[PDB]
Amino acid sequence: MEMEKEFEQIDKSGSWAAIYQDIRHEASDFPSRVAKLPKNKNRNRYRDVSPFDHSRIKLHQEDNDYINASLIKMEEAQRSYILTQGPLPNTVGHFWEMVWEQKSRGVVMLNRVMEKGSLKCAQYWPQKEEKEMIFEDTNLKLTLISEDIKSYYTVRQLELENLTTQETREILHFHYTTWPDFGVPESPASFLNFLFKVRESGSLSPEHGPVVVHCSAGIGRSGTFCLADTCLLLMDKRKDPSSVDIKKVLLEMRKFRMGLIQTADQLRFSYLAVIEGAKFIM
Ligand SMILES: O=C1OC[C@@H]2N1[C@H]1CC[C@]2(O)CC1
């Protein structure tokens, strides 16, 4: 079925939970043996969210190459994404090592450091120009260059220096700051505006490594971001945009990381975002 009228048909019939459970039943199950090794316990935020072995990002290190991060490679859309958990106190150096080694231009953050009165990820970037951060375990230096605070999101320019080689690179930090502590946004308008700002920066384009996108677990809000982006790109590429099947795209993405889209409300919000976004594109 088309999307907008399939949407109204699920609303009128109140069957979002059943649709979402079907997706959960059909989703891929691949091994995640490296994630579960005892030496990696303090590298995982949640015991039930792990990268598959076949798609995990490897650190360029011989001691321990493990990070909780997955490469989502979308062949028809010609887009790739790295989805990862919010960094932990003992993985902030690994996080920036990955950004460096994968040649990423942009980092997309969809959570606040504290939500619901608890810490959802480490404070992993510097908050003042004159107070830079050094990660001694991976030999990187990170400096805040500029910050632009808007009503729904903040964009930061960062300098990452590989201290072994003295090479430097400019990284863009796109921070969506207004996702509610509970539920999903009422309108997709600010989320779509944010997506378009990330696109306009070059951070999603083939002349760079894959964008790094995270929330707390790296599957819920993060899944919504890449699902909406890929569906909109396919609607532009194809002769028949009504042939784009959001459930099929989501199942394709779940071949590369488990659990993408965590609730039926996040599934409905993803439909809403793609529907509204397709009208603005034209
Ligand atoms: O190989 C790809 O690339 C992208 C996904 N896919 C097939 C199935 C679902 C898609 O979204 C479109 C066709």
UniProtKB/Swiss-Prot annotation:
Source taxon at top rank: Eukaryota
Modified residues (Cysteine persulfide): C215
Tissue specificity note: Expressed in keratinocytes (at protein level).
A biological process term (GO) from this entry: IRE1-mediated unfolded protein response
Chain positions found as Cysteine sulfenic acid (-SOH): C215
Phenotype upon changing C215S: Catalytically inactive mutant; abolishes sulfhydration
Name recorded for this polypeptide: Tyrosine-protein phosphatase non-receptor type 1
Species of the source: Homo sapiens
